[PDB]
Amino acid sequence: ADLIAYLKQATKGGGGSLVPRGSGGGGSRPWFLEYCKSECHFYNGTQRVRLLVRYFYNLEENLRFDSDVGEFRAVTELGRPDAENWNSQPEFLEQKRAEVDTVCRHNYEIFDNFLVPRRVEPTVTVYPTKTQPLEHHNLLVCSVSDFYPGNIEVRWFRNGKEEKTGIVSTGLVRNGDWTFQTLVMLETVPQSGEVYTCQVEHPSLTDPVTVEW
Amino acid sequence: IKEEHTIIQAEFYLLPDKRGEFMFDFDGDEIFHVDIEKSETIWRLEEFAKFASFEAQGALANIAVDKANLDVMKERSNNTPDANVAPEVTVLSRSPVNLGEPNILICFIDKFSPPVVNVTWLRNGRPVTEGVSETVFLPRDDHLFRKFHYLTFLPSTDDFYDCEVDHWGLEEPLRKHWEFEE
Ligand SMILES: *[C@@H]1O[C@H](CO)[C@@H](O[C@H]2O[C@H](CO)[C@@H](O)[C@H](O)[C@H]2NC(C)=O)[C@H](O)[C@H]1NC(C)=O
Numbered sequence A: 001a002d003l004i005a006y007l008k009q010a011t012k013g014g015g016g017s018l019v020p021r022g023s024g025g026g027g028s029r030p031w032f033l034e035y036c037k038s039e040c041h042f043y044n045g046t047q048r049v050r051l052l053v054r055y056f057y058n059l060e061e062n063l064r065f066d067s068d069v070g071e072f073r074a075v076t077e078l079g080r081p082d083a084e085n086w087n088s089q090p091e092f093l094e095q096k097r098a099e100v101d102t103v104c105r106h107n108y109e110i111f112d113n114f115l116v117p118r119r120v121e122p123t124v125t126v127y128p129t130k131t132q133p134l135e136h137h138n139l140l141v142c143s144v145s146d147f148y149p150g151n152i153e154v155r156w157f158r159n160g161k162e163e164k165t166g167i168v169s170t171g172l173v174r175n176g177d178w179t180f181q182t183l184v185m186l187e188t189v190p191q192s193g194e195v196y197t198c199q200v201e202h203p204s205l206t207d208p209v210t211v212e213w
Numbered sequence B: 001i002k003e004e005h006t007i008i009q010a011e012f013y014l015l016p017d018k019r020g021e022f023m024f025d026f027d028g029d030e031i032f033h034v035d036i037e038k039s040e041t042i043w044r045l046e047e048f049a050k051f052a053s054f055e056a057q058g059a060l061a062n063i064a065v066d067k068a069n070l071d072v073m074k075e076r077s078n079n080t081p082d083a084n085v086a087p088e089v090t091v092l093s094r095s096p097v098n099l100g101e102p103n104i105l106i107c108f109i110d111k112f113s114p115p116v117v118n119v120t121w122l123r124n125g126r127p128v129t130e131g132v133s134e135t136v137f138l139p140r141d142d143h144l145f146r147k148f149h150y151l152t153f154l155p156s157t158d159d160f161y162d163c164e165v166d167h168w169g170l171e172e173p174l175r176k177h178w179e180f181e182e
């Protein structure tokens, strides 16, 4: 088990006070949130890497650090003080700029061992689902569930003819537990002379999963 | 080939609740988060545990700074609050629902802040407190949050479920509804 690094949080300095900027409340319970996201953007593994730190106060993002810039940039006036306070600290800037390596790249290397390579195969099953009066558009449902990563193509073929219209989907759906699912339905009126096929392609598979109806 | 991925280190401190959070995210999923109080690393999936390690103290230290920063922010904005943003609740089963075959129910809470809520599962109007679990507050692209609540269950015609979500940005609790459909 190799240690995962992280970005050390910097201290803000009191002093100034900005004219009552963004208002809000209207009765709602007054809350105060300090929130920060440090994002490691891998455009192709550690080959291309961009670190993006974003500070938020309540509902507004106010301060930012795009590694491509090398300095903190205020997004709203609320965060300028910090921009000025930290950018004038030549020491700090170096520490941050280097985190793209000592943290982003550092961690990715680790993560490339079990996360990047992770693969869970989908489960495909087609089926109709509506009352039988057929006073709608007999929705042919193609369920591709329990798969990872998200990347996936779910195509419908009516008599070898790819249905490029009438396809109602939920889109990709995140389960929160490192697994996805999706529903690509097809509006049509079934006929024992037509064969609708649901093709499914995805990194875990080796050969497009074909299901018929 | 080409591996595009994004790792996020999301963290926050909230008042007055005095709640803190420190978590890592991979391509949208939680890798792990730290139990601030019990000072320990909780992996989203158990398996992840043998492939790496994280020093939870690291997170606490950070939350300290975060907590402090919050005060400067309050002192800098003259304690001006903002509105609360109520969540969108969605309930869907984790897998295709087959009768008598054990499945899971996912309550999806999204687009909201502050990062706090009270969630309750209802099996036939009866609160469920077993076979349930929840994720911590998850980062979104913007400034809001999303969350997940899970309920283990056994599909049966005679049953109906409800996910009740309460958030300060709501007048009355939101009660989404899920009932077996074939
Ligand atoms: C992305 O970076 C990878 C390095 O991880 C580059 O390498 C891959 O592609 C090479 C040829 O293009 C192969 O020689 C390598 O085997 C393969 N991965 C390895 C093991 O290095 C890749 O070229 C880069 N891709 C892009 C889009 O630039």
Ligand SMILES: *[C@@H]1O[C@H](CO)[C@@H](O)[C@H](O)[C@H]1NC(C)=O
Binding pocket: B078, B079
């Ligand atoms: C800060 O807000 C309070 C009310 O919330 C107001 O009374 C006070 O004048 C403000 N502080 C100043 C003087 O900027």
Ligand SMILES: *[C@@H]1O[C@H](CO)[C@@H](O)[C@H](O)[C@H]1NC(C)=O
Binding pocket: B117, B118, B166, B167, B168
């Ligand atoms: C949530 O529940 C807590 C107690 O568990 C309570 O103090 C708080 O007011 C509730 N928040 C709301 C109304 O969403």
